[PDB]
Design an enzyme around this catalytic site. Structure first.
Site, PDB file in Angstrom:
ATOM      1  N   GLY B 169       0.804  -1.037  -0.224  1.00  0.00           N
ATOM      2  CA  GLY B 169       0.070   0.046  -0.157  1.00  0.00           C
ATOM      3  C   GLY B 169       0.830   1.310   0.117  1.00  0.00           C
ATOM      4  N   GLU B 175       3.813   4.258   3.790  1.00  0.00           N
ATOM      5  CA  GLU B 175       3.522   3.003   3.087  1.00  0.00           C
ATOM      6  C   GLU B 175       2.959   1.835   4.100  1.00  0.00           C
ATOM      7  OE1 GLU B 175       6.724   4.261   3.063  1.00  0.00           O
ATOM      8  OE2 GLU B 175       6.009   5.655   1.423  1.00  0.00           O
ATOM      9  N   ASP B 288     -16.786   7.043   6.546  1.00  0.00           N
ATOM     10  CA  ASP B 288     -15.848   7.087   5.402  1.00  0.00           C
ATOM     11  C   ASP B 288     -15.758   5.966   4.427  1.00  0.00           C
ATOM     12  OD1 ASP B 288     -14.136   8.831   3.835  1.00  0.00           O
ATOM     13  OD2 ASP B 288     -12.610   7.330   4.428  1.00  0.00           O
TER      14      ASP B 288
HETATM   15  O1  LIG Z   1      -2.887   2.610   1.409  1.00  0.00           O
HETATM   16  C1  LIG Z   1      -3.527   2.326   2.286  1.00  0.00           C
HETATM   17  C2  LIG Z   1      -3.679   1.197   2.748  1.00  0.00           C
HETATM   18  C3  LIG Z   1      -2.870   0.073   2.412  1.00  0.00           C
HETATM   19  C4  LIG Z   1      -2.845  -1.097   2.838  1.00  0.00           C
HETATM   20  C5  LIG Z   1      -3.778  -1.542   3.964  1.00  0.00           C
HETATM   21  C6  LIG Z   1      -4.059  -2.470   4.533  1.00  0.00           C
HETATM   22  C7  LIG Z   1      -4.818  -3.135   5.633  1.00  0.00           C
HETATM   23  N1  LIG Z   1      -4.536  -4.543   6.104  1.00  0.00           N
HETATM   24  N2  LIG Z   1      -3.747  -4.949   4.816  1.00  0.00           N
HETATM   25  C8  LIG Z   1      -3.456  -3.934   4.035  1.00  0.00           C
HETATM   26  C9  LIG Z   1      -4.721  -0.378   4.331  1.00  0.00           C
HETATM   27  C10 LIG Z   1      -4.593   1.101   3.913  1.00  0.00           C
HETATM   28  N3  LIG Z   1      -5.348   1.851   4.345  1.00  0.00           N
HETATM   29  C11 LIG Z   1      -5.227   3.066   3.659  1.00  0.00           C
HETATM   30  N4  LIG Z   1      -4.271   3.300   2.800  1.00  0.00           N
HETATM   31  C12 LIG Z   1      -4.517   4.858   2.261  1.00  0.00           C
HETATM   32  C13 LIG Z   1      -3.443   5.348   3.234  1.00  0.00           C
HETATM   33  C14 LIG Z   1      -2.026   5.642   2.816  1.00  0.00           C
HETATM   34  C15 LIG Z   1      -1.269   6.281   3.740  1.00  0.00           C
HETATM   35  C16 LIG Z   1      -1.604   6.857   4.764  1.00  0.00           C
HETATM   36  C17 LIG Z   1      -2.985   6.925   5.124  1.00  0.00           C
HETATM   37  C18 LIG Z   1      -3.946   6.265   4.008  1.00  0.00           C
END
Ligand SMILES: O=c1c2ccc(-c3cn[nH]c3)cc2ncn1Cc1ccccc1
Lengths: 57, 625, 339
Positions: B169, B175, B288
């Protein structure tokens, strides 16, 4: 309260009613006891080291 | 590294630490995983007069999970006339004539709810709360429990505790990684933020609210929420240890695969609805709900993600317009109207609609002016494209009613009203919870999905209470990985150490048969530099603190009357105990765990104060002029 | 009114005792002894340092063989030493840390001890497996146990901070007799050579002479201006000495029913903690809160010598039955043997 203050005066009667010798006689008995045992007192004057358990013996 | 348990002596410290908190009860211990596990061990293998009750209890727990009613009718038969039944009645504990009356009553009508034997569970416990639990406290199982609770309460995670793999992510603050906890090896997702970025974008209030909301919802192992297990932080970045979801989000998959059908959408709606029902029971409004926050695992199942904007309403009843434009309910727009969970039921309508059409229900001309979207949602009513089915019409029409007094889930029964919509009439919500329906889209196992600076100090204070650990999840991780094996070698290491004291000893036990208050290891450093850190076994008595090395009973001590005070000091980034002695001398101690530091600091203050107050009223002991 | 007549009668009887004592104060011990020669300068050396206790020592007591002695310490232990060699014959950890006293049975079969636990515990030293085990816990005092002394293996006398003393039946564990009279914490006790009497010294600044077989107080002695911490009989049983926080020792004669002498000094201001006589009675030894033991000429009241070898309070001392040595216990952890 009263049984206690009464208990006291009765006790003092036992102490007041006793036989007492003269200090002069009591003091001579003590002095005579000391004299009669001065030779048996190892703290009075040191003893030969051979007779001293805490020295060579 | 490799979880190592403390030695059994830790019980002396730990039991007093727990006792002081009232955590040494059948309820507080039985309700814990490692607690229940060790307690069950004691009952099945060491207290015969209680083995049958635990057997029956576990057979009821097995029955409770039977999904098919045909299973439950078959098992409720085997159980009701089992040897565990004619073994409890035979012994001392025959269930009340009233309890047995309820059970076979439902058996007669051939009705087998999963809680069929619940009247038996309650009586079973009512017969384990007294002597049986007391006999367990006295046993070496509670001792092992103290050894595990010491580890749990001594957790200080660092990035060195995780093996980080690919990135899964990314966003505006950090990240998200795929890692494996070295202790147990379980696969987690690590959401790394950055205090440097947070300050830049003024997002501190969000990073703190996400962990408070995660704390409130990360209980119960909900399968439809990215839940937190740990929270820590290096001197530069906040870290969340969350459920691993290496399958991208819907906002991405939506664009790639294209719009979904009512059937493919039905799968997501059901799994999502169960997520909301979980939060709403814990008085948490998400606020949200959008495809970009719906994650997929490697099998295609979904979870609600990123609780940043969530909120509590058990007391607050929250505020104003917070969310994403196009998904916000009317109450979530009027900055002077209080709303509860009703904000999510509306947001789900816009959620599913964007999956069926491809855009928010209030943004068709692809307008980026929020005042336009917030205008269409607060004024005109939504009109479905005639292509929607009758049942699908009833759902969205109900979930989008601007009037909260006429919207699904807002009529007093919550999600039980949405689950009953004819649009879901074909679904078995039990099977939904078990994640037994086929996921519409299965992601491939290879995805890519989708500076500035400023210094620190006083902002580090805003994170002094960020570190957290969810007890339920750390114990579950331990139970499902290393628990039984660790408990095996730890048993052998303790047996051989006792066999060795046999050949050398016949001496024990120093702490027994006296008035010893507490004992255990600590590290001592004395006056002055001319000593260095040395580890010793201390014994605290009412009037003195003795300590020894190995292979010789204590030759040193320190009387309560010569101890002036007990202060908490700081040395090598490690908290210690500072003992000021009468002759201007100092005595510093360093405990092996945070609970030990709290219990020693407490027991020393109580010991020396009571002792000095005591010696004063004793002519033969007190200091004379 | 009935209480005002009992108080006035009680003070009348106190006058009689006071005047009766003055009636036989015809001479002073100092006068009677002016013809004997002074004992000279008494010097002794440390023959043994007994090492083993980890904290303050509160009490010791010699065995009847003049070789073994027991001592109780702040470290919650009784140690039974062999003074000749300095080896430990027994190290007895106690179940209560607040031990304040200890006693050695004449037979050598048992020792006892107690303290803030309000208990006098008897320990069998001649058990089956050579193990030392608590063989009785005498409970009954409502205050701490200040001192105790075996009459034999079946009887022990105890003094307590609860104001009382008691005679015990070690077998039945019951208080055969109570000795009620003091109005303050009883601090010490000493048995007459015949074990038919004993004397106690309490914080009410008085010592009493008790009839062992009748539980009656037969005579009371006063004169001290502070608490009496120590007491001991003159070898012949017709007198005893006392040590007080008022910086003085005092000698009392039983037949004369009054005080004979006072051992003090303008340079000695600390309190006395323990008193013992030399074999013949010529020397009165006393440990002091100034780390010293002063040797007094019992008959002439001079200071013959000073035992100076402790870095803290001399809390206890004792003289062996054969008179060969004195033992001093101190707050510095150590016992020393002098002669
Ligand atoms: O990129 C993500 C994200 C990626 C993976 C997972 C995830 C959860 N469990 N496994 C994978 C959750 C996530 N939630 C939000 N964002 C957007 C974001 C990025 C940076 C700062 C804040 C929000």
């Amino acid at each position: 309260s009263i049984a206690q203050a009464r208990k006291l005066v009765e006790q003092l009667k036992m102490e007041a009613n006793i036989d007492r010798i003269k200090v002069s006689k009591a003091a001579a008995d003590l002095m005579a006891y000391c004299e009669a045992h001065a030779k048996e007192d190892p703290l009075l004057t040191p003893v030969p080291a051979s007779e001293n358990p805490f020295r060579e013996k | 590294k490799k979880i190592l348990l403390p030695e059994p002596s830790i019980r002396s410290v730990m039991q007093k630490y727990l006792e002081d908190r009232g955590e040494v009860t059948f309820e507080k211990i039985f309700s814990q995983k490692l607690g229940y596990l060790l307690f069950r061990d004691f009952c099945l293998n060491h207290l015969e007069e209680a083995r049958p009750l635990v057997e029956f209890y576990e057979e009821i727990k097995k029955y409770e999970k039977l999904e098919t009613e045909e299973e439950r009718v078959a098992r409720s038969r085997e159980i009701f006339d089992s040897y565990i039944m004619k073994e409890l009645l035979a012994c001392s504990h025959p269930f009340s004539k009233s309890a047995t009356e309820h059970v076979q009553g439902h058996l007669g009508k051939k009705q087998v709810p999963p809680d069929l034997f619940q009247p038996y569970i309650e009586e079973i416990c009512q017969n384990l709360r007294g002597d049986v639990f007391q006999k367990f406290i006295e046993s070496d199982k509670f001792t092992r429990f103290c050894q595990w609770k010491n580890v749990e309460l001594n957790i200080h995670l660092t990035m060195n505790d995780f093996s980080v793999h690919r990135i899964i992510g990314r966003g505006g603050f950090g990240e998200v990684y795929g890692c494996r906890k070295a202790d147990t090896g379980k696969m987690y997702a690590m959401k790394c933020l950055d205090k440097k970025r947070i300050k830049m974008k003024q997002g501190e209030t969000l990073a703190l609210n996400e962990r408070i909301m995660l704390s409130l919802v990360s209980t119960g192992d909900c399968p439809f929420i990215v839940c937190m297990s740990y929270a820590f932080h290096t001197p530069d970045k906040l870290s969340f240890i969350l459920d691993l979801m290496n399958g991208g989000d819907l906002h991405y998959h939506l664009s790639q695969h294209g719009v979904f059908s009512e059937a493919d959408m039905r799968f997501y709606a059901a799994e999502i609805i169960l997520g909301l029902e979980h939060m709403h029971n814990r008085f948490v409004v998400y606020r949200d709900l959008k495809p970009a926050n719906i994650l997929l695992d490697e099998h295609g199942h979904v979870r609600i993600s990123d609780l940043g904007l969530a909120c509590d309403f058990s007391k607050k009843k929250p505020h104003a317009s917070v969310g994403t434009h196009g998904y916000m309910a009317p109450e979530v727009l009027q900055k002077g109207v209080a709303y509860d969970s009703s904000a999510d039921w509306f947001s789900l309508g816009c959620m599913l609609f964007k999956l069926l059409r491809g855009h928010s229900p209030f943004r068709q001309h692809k307008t980026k002016d929020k005042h336009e979207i917030d205008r269409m949602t607060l004024t005109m009513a939504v009109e479905l494209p005639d292509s929607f089915s009758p049942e699908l019409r009833s759902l969205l029409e109900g979930l989008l009613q601007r009037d909260v007094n006429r919207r699904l889930g807002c009529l007093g029964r919550g999600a039980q009203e949405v689950k009953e919509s004819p649009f879901f009439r074909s679904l078995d919500w039990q099977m939904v919870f078990l994640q037994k329906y086929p996921p519409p889209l299965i992601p491939p196992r290879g995805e890519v999905n989708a500076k500035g600076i400023k210094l620190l100090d006083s902002d580090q204070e805003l994170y002094r209470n960020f570190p957290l650990t969810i007890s339920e999840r750390w114990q579950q991780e331990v139970a499902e990985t290393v628990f039984d094996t660790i408990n095996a070698e730890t048993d052998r290491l303790e047996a051989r150490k006792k066999a060795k004291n046999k050949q050398l000893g016949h001496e024990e036990d120093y702490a027994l048969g006296k008035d010893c208050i507490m004992h255990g290891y600590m590290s001592k450093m004395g006056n002055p530099f001319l000593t260095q850190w040395q580890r010793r076994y201390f014994y605290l008595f009412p009037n003195r603190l003795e300590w020894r090395g190995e292979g010789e009973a204590p030759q040193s001590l320190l009387t309560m009357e010569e101890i002036q005070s007990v202060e908490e000091t700081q040395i090598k980034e490690r908290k210690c105990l500072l003992l000021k002695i009468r002759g201007g001398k100092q005595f510093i101690l360093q405990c092996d765990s945070d609970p030990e530091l709290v219990q020693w600091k407490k027991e020393l203050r109580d010991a020396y104060r009571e002792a000095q107050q005591l010696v004063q009223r004793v002519p033969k002991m007190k200091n004379k002029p | 009114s009935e209480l005002d007549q009992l108080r006035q009668e009680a003070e009348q009887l106190k006058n009689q005792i006071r005047d009766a004592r003055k009636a036989c104060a015809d001479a002073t011990l100092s006068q009677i002894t002016n013809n004997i020669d002074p004992v000279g300068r008494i010097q002794m050396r440390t023959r043994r340092t007994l090492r083993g206790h980890l904290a303050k020592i509160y009490a010791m007591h010699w065995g009847t063989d003049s070789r073994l002695l027991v001592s109780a310490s702040q470290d919650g232990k009784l140690i039974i030493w062999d003074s000749y060699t300095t080896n430990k014959v027994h190290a007895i950890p106690l179940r209560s840390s607040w031990v304040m006293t200890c006693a050695y049975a004449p037979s050598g079969n048992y020792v006892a001890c107690g303290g803030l636990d309000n208990i006098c515990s008897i320990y069998n030293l001649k058990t089956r497996e050579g193990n030392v085990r608590v063989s009785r816990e005498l409970a009954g005092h409502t205050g701490y146990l200040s001192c105790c002394r075996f009459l034999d293996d079946n009887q022990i006398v105890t003094s307590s901070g609860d104001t009382t003393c008691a005679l015990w039946d070690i077998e039945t564990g019951q208080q055969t007799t109570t000795f009620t009279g003091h109005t303050g914490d009883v601090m010490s006790l000493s048995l007459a050579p015949d074990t038919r009497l004993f004397v106690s010294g309490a914080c009410d600044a008085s010592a009493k002479l008790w009839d062992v077989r009748e539980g009656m107080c037969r005579q009371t002695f006063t004169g001290h201006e502070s608490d009496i911490n120590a007491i001991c009989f003159f070898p012949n049983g017709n007198a005893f000495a006392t040590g007080s926080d008022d910086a003085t020792c005092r000698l009392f004669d039983l037949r004369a029913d009054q005080e004979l002498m006072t051992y003090s000094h303008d340079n000695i201001i600390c309190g006395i903690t323990s008193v013992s006589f030399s074999k013949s009675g010529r020397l009165l030894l006393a440990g002091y809160d100034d780390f010293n033991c002063n040797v007094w000429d019992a008959l002439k009241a001079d200071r013959a010598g000073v035992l100076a070898g402790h870095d803290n309070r001399v809390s206890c001392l004792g003289v062996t039955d054969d008179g060969m040595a004195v033992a001093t216990g101190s707050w510095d952890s150590f016992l020393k043997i002098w002669n």
